[PDB]
Amino acid sequence: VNDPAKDATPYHVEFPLFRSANMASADKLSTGVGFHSFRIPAVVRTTTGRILAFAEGRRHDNRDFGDINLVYKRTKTTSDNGATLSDWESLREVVGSGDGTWGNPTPVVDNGTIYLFLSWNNGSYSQKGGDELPDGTITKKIDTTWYGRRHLYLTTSTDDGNTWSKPQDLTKELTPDGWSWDAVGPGNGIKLSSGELVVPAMGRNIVGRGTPGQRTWSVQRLNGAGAEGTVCETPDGKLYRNDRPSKAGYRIVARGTLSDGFSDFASDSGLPDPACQGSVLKYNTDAPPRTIFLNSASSDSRRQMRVRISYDADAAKYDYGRKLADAPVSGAGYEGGYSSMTKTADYKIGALVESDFFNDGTGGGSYRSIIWRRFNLSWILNGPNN
Numbered sequence: 001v002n003d004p005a006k007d008a009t010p011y012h013v014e015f016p017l018f019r020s021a022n023m024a025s026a027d028k029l030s031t032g033v034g035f036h037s038f039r040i041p042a043v044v045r046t047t048t049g050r051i052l053a054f055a056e057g058r059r060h061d062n063r064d065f066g067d068i069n070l071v072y073k074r075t076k077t078t079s080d081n082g083a084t085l086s087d088w089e090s091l092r093e094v095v096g097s098g099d100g101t102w103g104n105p106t107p108v109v110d111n112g113t114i115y116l117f118l119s120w121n122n123g124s125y126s127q128k129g130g131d132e133l134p135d136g137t138i139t140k141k142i143d144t145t146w147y148g149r150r151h152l153y154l155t156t157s158t159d160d161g162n163t164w165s166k167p168q169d170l171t172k173e174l175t176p177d178g179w180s181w182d183a184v185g186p187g188n189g190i191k192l193s194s195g196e197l198v199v200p201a202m203g204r205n206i207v208g209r210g211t212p213g214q215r216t217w218s219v220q221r222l223n224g225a226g227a228e229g230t231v232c233e234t235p236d237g238k239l240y241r242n243d244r245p246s247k248a249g250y251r252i253v254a255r256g257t258l259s260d261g262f263s264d265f266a267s268d269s270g271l272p273d274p275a276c277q278g279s280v281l282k283y284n285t286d287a288p289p290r291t292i293f294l295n296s297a298s299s300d301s302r303r304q305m306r307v308r309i310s311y312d313a314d315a316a317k318y319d320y321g322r323k324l325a326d327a328p329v330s331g332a333g334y335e336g337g338y339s340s341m342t343k344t345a346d347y348k349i350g351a352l353v354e355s356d357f358f359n360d361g362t363g364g365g366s367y368r369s370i371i372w373r374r375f376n377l378s379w380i381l382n383g384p385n386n
């Protein structure tokens with residue numbers, strides 16, 4: 001495929017944006033509250049061009065449960081595109097009430113309004129149960145009760161991310177009755193060419209019909225979908241789910257529409273995955289249309305981050321793409337894990353990528369940071385193995 005973007009000089013910048021407690025400029029809230037680790041990134045460019053970057057602020061250690069607040073940064077202006085560290089505001093909080101887990105940021109932009117879907121659980125519960133919290137208490141396993149299940153929340157901003165509504169619990173509307181575990185995203189939702197909002201979630205899409213300023217939400221159930229899904233519209237106008245598999249190996253993919261539903265999910269042997277979240281992005285709709293995909297391109301490691309382009313109408317096949325390790329960051333740990341992508345207003349891919357200092361190996365004390373990257377399509381296309 002002829003691609004004019006290759007003619008641009010390759011461009012890339014990369015730096016830590018969410019700095020764990022061990023780092024020189026560790027990110028803290030204005031209250032003084034700091035965080036051991038930041039995980040689970042989500043990023044969107046708003047219709048103003050401002051960029052909003054979200055994460056889980058994991059207060060005491062790197063684990064998925066306990067006291068976790070939903071934190072964020074915005075770019076200082078609507079036209080800086082997050083190009084340098086000095087272009088980013090200080091850390092802020094969307095929600096951090098109680099001692100429970102607020103997480104799984106999954107934003108979608110609708111004119112303007114930013115809708116941020118979130119998962120929540122009580123601070124005494126964890127996915128497996130039996131985990132020891134910092135105060136000594138042993139968690140109960142997430143269950144099907146109102147009190148012990150994973151909830152689904154929506155918080156909305158109508159001032160370019162400056163302020164956020166009190167999160168609304170939409171579990172009874174948008175999560176099947178009798179579920180225990182749940183997840184939304186994490187990463188992002190999308191707005192279709194036809195106007196609907198589609199937010200990927202465990203076993204389902206959350207679908208916003210209506211119009212901007214008057215959205216109505218419902219569930220499209222997807223048998224065989226992952227817990228952590230991604231969605232985009234492909235050049236043929238259909239929907240594409242590319243989800244984390246339940247076991248390490250390969251991404252699982254399904255295609256469909258809002259009106260007629262989805263195919264079954266199948267392993268995509270072109271996209272190895274170690275059972276980790278990934279991210280997908282519709283980059284552009286005219287010649288040549290491109291879908292971007294980002295994950296760890298390995299069946300056993302999260303440290304093989306690879307960004308790729310598909311030109312196919314159904315995103316069937318991707319190029320080799322480029323290893324993010326070709327432009328490594330120093331002093332922010334070993335990069336790899338969950339990721340999120342947006343298209344900036346200056347026509348770059350903006351990506352957030354997890355990084356792990358590994359100071360406590362695989363244990364809970366290992367500090368986690370999140371790296372911000374900008375690169376043009378040329379950078380991907382001019383990679384050594386592409």
Ligand SMILES: O=C(O)[C@@]1(O)C[C@H](O)[C@@H](O)[C@H]([C@H](O)[C@H](O)CO)O1
Pocket residue numbers: 040064127183227228275276
């Ligand atoms: O680093 C991970 O893999 C993680 O643990 C991080 C997330 O906070 C957690 O919600 C998610 C979940 O455990 C799996 O999707 C299995 O349902 O995975």
